[PDB]
């Protein structure tokens, strides 16, 4: 268009984009800043980095970029490259892996009154100190801090477009649920520049994790192997195999704890409850293995070399349960006595196994009352 070509030639003829859009240098540029979250691309918990797709809406008045539409065929709005005009230097303070400022530099909208709306896209890879306590039933609060970074509040003051970031076009994450989101404006005095305040806007998102994936992949096998731990108490010592699946379950729990460790960041701020549960389960399995060894040793006690003490016999057999030719005959009598003593030891071992089984089922049903 001839009119728009002439208008753009006239507007930028003596325009210096180094200088702020103020009539007088004592004035400040008022910039309305808004954030539009398009997609939560990823949340790397181990590296503690949240990367999102955003649009950074910025509106401000440039008094040097106004015209009369009557002189230009009625044109009231044009599109200009962002590199041709003065732009705010918004910087993502908590940048972890990427760019501090906008790098795409898309075109902006300019109307005849000098108002400029600029909505550049960005991939914000910001630092989020993730809280690992209630993993994986945990909510994470992560923020983006945006500021002018070179002009104080008396030069390029900014204000939030609305109290909340815009999520009207937000793609559902599937892995996280946006419980809440809000933006707050702050005046900060830094160590660099304590005399004057610098303005920033912090947008925080509180997002709840959907635990189905981690539940299915981690929690269910751990519960299965815990139920497998109590079974060793009901497994008779006479079949062997007690140590076999006892150690098998212990190794499985160790492997799943290793997986959980690989899932979470190495930070020591807090101990995950899933990790505490796995550690306590491993300690319970270790204690069960120790008692299993004791029971096997008691079951295989030699009737001759080892004699049963009186107190253990009394309690474990009374309280808890209620809760040439002359040579062969002598040999058979001695063998009968030895067999009776061996049976006494085996009965004591069986009664320890049943007590431990009753203890484990209590643990289980109390955990059920806990649900």
């Amino acid at each position: 268009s001839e009119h728009e070509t002439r208008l753009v030639a006239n507007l930028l003829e003596n325009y210096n984009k180094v200088i702020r859009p103020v009539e007088h240098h004592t004035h400040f540029v008022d910039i309305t800043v808004g954030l539009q979250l398009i997609q939560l691309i990823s949340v790397d918990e181990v590296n503690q980095i949240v990367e999102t797709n955003v649009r950074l809406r910025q509106q401000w008045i440039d008094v040097r970029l106004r015209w009369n539409p009557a002189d230009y065929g009625g044109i009231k709005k044009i599109r200009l490259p962002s590199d041709d005009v003065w732009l705010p230097d918004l910087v993502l303070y908590n940048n972890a892996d990427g760019d501090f400022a906008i790098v795409h530099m898309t075109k902006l909208l300019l109307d005849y009154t000098g108002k400029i709306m600029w909505t550049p896209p960005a991939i914000f890879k910001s630092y989020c100190e993730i809280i690992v306590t209630h993993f994986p039933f945990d909510q994470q609060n992560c923020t983006m801090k945006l500021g002018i970074w070179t002009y104080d509040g008396t030069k390029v003051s900014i204000s939030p477009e609305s109290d909340r970031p815009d999520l009207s076009t937000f793609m559902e994450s599937g892995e996280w649920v946006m419980k809440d989101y809000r933006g707050w404006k702050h005046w900060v005095y830094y160590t660099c520049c304590p005399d004057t305040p610098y303005l920033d806007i912090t947008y925080h998102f509180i997002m709840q994790r959907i635990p189905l994936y981690f539940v299915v992949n981690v929690i269910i096998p751990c519960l299965l192997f815990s139920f497998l731990t109590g079974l060793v108490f009901y497994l008779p010592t006479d079949s062997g195999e007690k140590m076999t699946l006892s150690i098998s379950v212990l190794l499985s729990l160790t492997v799943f704890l290793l997986v959980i460790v690989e899932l979470i960041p190495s930070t020591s701020s807090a101990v995950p409850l899933i990790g505490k549960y796995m550690l306590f389960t491993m300690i319970f399995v270790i204690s069960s293995i120790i008692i299993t060894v004791v029971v096997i040793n008691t079951h295989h006690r030699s009737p001759s070399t080892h004699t049963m003490p009186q107190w253990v016999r009394k309690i474990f057999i009374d309280t808890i349960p209620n809760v040439g030719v002359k040579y062969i005959a002598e040999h058979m009598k001695s063998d009968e006595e030895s067999s009776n003593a061996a049976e006494e030891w085996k009965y004591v071992a069986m009664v320890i196994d049943h007590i431990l089984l009753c203890v484990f089922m209590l643990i289980c049903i109390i955990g059920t009352v806990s649900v």
Binding site: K107, F214, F227, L231, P236, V325
Partner: protein
Amino acid sequence: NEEGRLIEKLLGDYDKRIIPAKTLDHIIDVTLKLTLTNLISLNEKEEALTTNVWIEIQWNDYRLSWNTSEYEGIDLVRIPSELLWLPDVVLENNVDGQFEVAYYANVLVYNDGSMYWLPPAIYRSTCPIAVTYFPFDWQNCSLVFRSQTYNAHEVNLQLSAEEGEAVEWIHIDPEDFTENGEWTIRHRPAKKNYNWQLTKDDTDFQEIIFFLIIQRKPLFYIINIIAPCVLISSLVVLVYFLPAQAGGQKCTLSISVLLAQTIFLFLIAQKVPETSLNVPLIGKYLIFVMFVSMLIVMNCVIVLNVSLRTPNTHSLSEKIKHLFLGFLPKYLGMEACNFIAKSTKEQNDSGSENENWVLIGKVIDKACFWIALLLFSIGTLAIFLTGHFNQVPEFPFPGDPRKYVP
């Protein structure tokens, strides 16, 4: 070369920053066409579809028009796209920051101002993965193209037409198309979409969406994951024929099968996305077979407990013995030497009680074997019949009667 004079004349008083609107309230018609050269991949981990495409963008720029007779009959020129105004058509739903095309080829300019641009692009677009029926799943991915800078009052995005017929599908050129080998394209429709939550001055009011509906070929997964897992989960049931006398090793076999199922769980978790909106079909099967294995380990423990008890440590009630040994095997398929003599008879009396407990355990083993066989077989059949019956919809859009094919 007269093309030098022509191009120098055209681009003299020309700047690429001005939309070529002839007058006020003039809307530039921009026509889009997509050619899929190769569906490079569908990364499930990051839910990204990577495709090699040629994007054909056609519009009209009245400034770039000339008279053929005045330039020795030249009617076509190639001008670098960096020197020209472009409608700024971008892929909106990109996983990375890549909005625009990869190459920025030359634009073909005709003497009437017609602008024809056909740049190549490697596009990595977002599409959520429906994991319910993996690996017998079909995905419905889309490529959304918008104008990043102009709204519906300035440009008019449309689908290209050939002979008055609109091209409402993704074009596939037989000369330069490659089969993916894992995904088969069933439907490839295209349509112009609106928001109706935005007015036509918002640059997101209008968009053009190209849909790729693709069905996974499950032969690889069936051979390499499903079949071995089914074989191990069938091996579970062999514990019921092993003895319960500190040999045969029922518990070791069952626990080891459970461990193998855990290994398969880790492999599948490695090969499936972490969406957490649904449990994968093979994941559901793995959870089912692990719970069955856990019950079989418990049943093996119970059988060992019941078959190893003795009258010295356990009392065999006549009720239980009679009930089992009568009801179940019918229903299913089955000086003085007196001191020495009286002690010899003692072993026979004690040994007989052990045999009864052994027979009861075998009765439980046979009864529980059929339940385990029935439970495993139905669960294996039902789960994988669901995937076999997961069919791609007959139409690109389930309500529309149209097929969207050339």
